[PDB]
Design an enzyme around this catalytic site. Structure first.
Site, PDB file in Angstrom:
ATOM      1  N   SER A 120       0.846  -1.179   0.000  1.00  0.00           N
ATOM      2  CA  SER A 120       0.000   0.000   0.000  1.00  0.00           C
ATOM      3  C   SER A 120       0.897   1.250   0.000  1.00  0.00           C
ATOM      4  O   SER A 120       1.702   1.426   0.911  1.00  0.00           O
ATOM      5  CB  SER A 120      -0.923  -0.007   1.222  1.00  0.00           C
ATOM      6  OG  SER A 120      -2.133   0.673   0.942  1.00  0.00           O
ATOM      7  N   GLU A 121       0.730   2.112  -1.005  1.00  0.00           N
ATOM      8  CA  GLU A 121       1.578   3.311  -1.163  1.00  0.00           C
ATOM      9  C   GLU A 121       1.522   4.317  -0.025  1.00  0.00           C
ATOM     10  O   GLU A 121       2.334   5.242   0.020  1.00  0.00           O
ATOM     11  CB  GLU A 121       1.364   4.038  -2.508  1.00  0.00           C
ATOM     12  CG  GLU A 121      -0.038   4.496  -2.802  1.00  0.00           C
ATOM     13  CD  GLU A 121      -0.802   3.484  -3.665  1.00  0.00           C
ATOM     14  OE1 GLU A 121      -0.857   2.240  -3.324  1.00  0.00           O
ATOM     15  OE2 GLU A 121      -1.360   3.963  -4.693  1.00  0.00           O
ATOM     16  N   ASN A 122       0.566   4.140   0.885  1.00  0.00           N
ATOM     17  CA  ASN A 122       0.528   4.944   2.105  1.00  0.00           C
ATOM     18  C   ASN A 122       1.483   4.461   3.219  1.00  0.00           C
ATOM     19  O   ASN A 122       1.557   5.068   4.283  1.00  0.00           O
ATOM     20  CB  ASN A 122      -0.911   5.158   2.602  1.00  0.00           C
ATOM     21  CG  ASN A 122      -1.704   3.863   2.759  1.00  0.00           C
ATOM     22  OD1 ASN A 122      -2.602   3.786   3.590  1.00  0.00           O
ATOM     23  ND2 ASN A 122      -1.387   2.856   1.966  1.00  0.00           N
TER      24      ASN A 122
END
Lengths: 200, 229, 212, 229
Positions: A45-47
């Site tokens: 997840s890019e977060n």
């Protein structure tokens, strides 16, 4: 609606054992729930999470733990958390094996537009980084509104970035600027695709 | 007790008309909700806010937008904000849309003293129009510029009297980096502990980057999508 | 040689104001930490990735994963933190360090510094080049004169430069010098010394301050 | 998992002419075991990138003294009398690079950044042949991302998925080197099962590490052992 069921089933097949995969918001995130037991892999997840797991049990969701789409989620065994700069170091630096994304259009050279319509503007988010840093770019997208273009109209997410496109209809592959069709009836695709293509 | 302040209000008094403000949080995750509430209440204006998103119209930075405090927004995703989206479309709000990777790294560069750095993200797109292009190894890159704010407003799980920060899970996102880029940095913390209470090898953002520490709610953490099996 | 050093060190201590984050470089400046007075609370940054240097460990207690920039065994103070090298220079380069005290082989009129290399004697510069460009305030402590009697305070440096126009304040065993946009100004004087002596002993050009 | 039975095996992954990037600062946080295995394999013409070159006795100095290095990229050399005479012979090329620049370069290469600007080294021999650019009225020089064929790194703990945690100042270059290596080998004092490392403790996510070995905890060399009593 089964169209999309054919589309995710087929998308599971791009993902090999040991890969580190990024699933784009919308359609590609559905793939998560079709990963067979045999396939051991980490979902990014890019977060700032490496190790996305399925949705949490009622009463056990956690505000601090979400996917890039803002959905409450779960971490897996031996997952890791990191900050945004790190996350894009992983992405920009080419560590991410495979990225799957949706699209509003794909050009013939495999340009992708998936972030905006002049006059609806959600914004690019991580898409542009993904499209330029993932070693493998796969788009799953409905074929018509046609969406398989000779030239894009909507603003580009990326230019000559997709390797493989899959739709309700068929499967397309790009090598050095030009399009083929690796997978399928046949006769409908000339008719249906605004783009130009080859096969052997 | 050292850097710790009494109140959100006391802390807002430190933000001034026409400042650049850098804010941690991804969607509604790890945002300094109280800090934001009190800036809304202080009514400070002409702000240049930089943060990945603009909250929702109902919560986070979207509360400032609605109260008309933002002159310009630098972010990567509008998403489920209809006030942002429409004001964007309108030209009402001046918006600089920045790929998320580039945004993170620009903020990190501001804090790391990097004025400029090259990336492939967005070449061949409208994002790269008007910026220096340079080839390395045959491939084309765009120059992106370091970002610096007058104030950084970040959210943490634990803070010490000395500004050291630990984040929890996915609540970290932009917070460590936003901390570096703000000239004055205010951290909002669910838990405050005395210095020495946090393990030096667990600390995520060293106290050097933090000038003020304030206590935040940990039940007012909000969820955009409650997606449960 | 030992009062020279004790003079220089004692004057440098006065640069640490409460609340500062400070980096002390290899050599003479590491001595300054001892003689920090109790009123003053500060954190010393070690560029190998620690904010919060403490004194040498009790004999027997020394740990191999914990050393300062000079590769010596050290300790951690209340509230310390560890981080990687890229982070460490993010702090230094980003202007977060309030003060760096460094040694020197030569300083020049314009506040250039040279302290990493003698052509024909090749060690390396480590963190010094980063420090001189990134700390808010740059202070050098250096013996005014070399063994052979030649001055180290020059018009132009004869040695490879650590940094160009970087020194805010120079303290010698003889004098204190300030730099404000290229110009050097003699600002204070150590105990034995007059302005004459400092002329006689300096190759650099300087204004003498309004008050000394 | 990612785990290899011995350093011997692991060392076969380094070849004649590779760029080796090696963690450690001084003798601290260095992959002593991997280096030994490398010395024994006899591999040659290495370009090695590491902060220092160990001592002439231990760490990277072992490679130097077996004649295995074509070129060193480092910030500081130290007291190597093997070092000085290979250089002076023409047979060892040295690139002394400012420490902060060396860290950010390895990070850069790992992070996909081909280049970035810094003030470090401006008006110095370090500036020679680099791009100079003005930002807010001041000069910066361009520094280029470094990338390696193999990275060799030392951890306090690793899990079987390659997640690393470090210890005190033994961290240094290890995490950033882990990133810049085409093949990253982590030498660890403890190898735990995946799940013993709190995901919020982990310093280098598993994605950066492709192999893992068990190393030594008992014999850590202290270069200078400064004490009081």
């Amino acid at each position: 609606k089964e169209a999309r069921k054919r589309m995710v089933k087929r998308a599971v097949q791009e993902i090999k054992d040991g890969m580190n995969v990024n699933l784009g918001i919308g359609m590609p995130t559905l793939v998560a729930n079709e990963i067979p037991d045999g396939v051991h892999v980490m979902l990014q997840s890019e977060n700032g999470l490496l190790g996305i797991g399925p949705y949490p049990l009622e009463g056990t969701e956690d505000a601090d733990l979400i996917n890039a789409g803002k959905e409450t989620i779960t971490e897996v065994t031996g997952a890791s958390y990191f900050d945004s700069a790190e996350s894009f170091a992983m992405i920009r630096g080419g560590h991410i094996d495979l990225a799957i994304l949706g699209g509003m259009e794909v050009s013939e050279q495999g340009d992708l537009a998936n972030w905006m319509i002049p006059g609806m503007v959600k914004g690019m988010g991580g898409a542009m980084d993904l499209v330029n840093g993932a070693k493998r770019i796969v788009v799953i997208m409905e074929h018509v509104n046609s969406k398989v273009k000779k030239t894009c109209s909507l603003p580009l997410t990326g230019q000559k970035v997709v390797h493989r496109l899959i739709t309700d209809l068929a499967v397309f592959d790009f090598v050095n600027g030009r399009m083929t069709l690796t997978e399928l009836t046949i006769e409908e695709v000339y008719e249906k695709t605004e783009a130009d293509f080859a096969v052997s | 007790m050292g850097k710790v302040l009494s109140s959100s209000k006391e802390a807002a008094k430190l933000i001034h008309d026409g400042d650049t403000l850098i804010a941690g949080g991804f969607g509604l995750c790890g945002i300094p909700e109280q800090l934001i509430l009190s800036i809304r209440d202080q009514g400070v204006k002409d702000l240049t806010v930089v943060s990945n998103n603009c909250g929702v119209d109902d919560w986070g930075l979207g509360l400032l937008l609605a109260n008309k405090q933002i002159k310009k927004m630098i972010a990567s995703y509008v998403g489920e904000n209809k006030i942002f989206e429409r004001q964007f479309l309108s030209g009402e709000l001046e918006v600089e849309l920045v790929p998320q990777g580039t945004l993170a790294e620009r903020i990190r560069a501001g804090g790391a003293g990097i004025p400029g750095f090259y990336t492939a993200t967005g070449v061949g797109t409208s994002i790269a129009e008007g910026k220096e292009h340079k080839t390395f190894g045959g491939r084309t890159y765009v120059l992106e510029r370091g970002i610096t704010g007058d104030v950084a407003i970040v959210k943490a799980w634990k803070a010490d009297t000395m500004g050291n920060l630990i984040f929890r899970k996915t609540a970290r996102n932009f917070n460590p980096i936003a901390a570096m880029a703000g000239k004055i940095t205010i951290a909002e913390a669910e838990e405050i502990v005395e210095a020495g209470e946090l393990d030096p090898d667990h600390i995520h953002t060293p106290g050097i980057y933090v000038q003020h520490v304030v206590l935040g709610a940990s039940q007012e953490k909000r969820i955009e999508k409650r997606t449960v099996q």
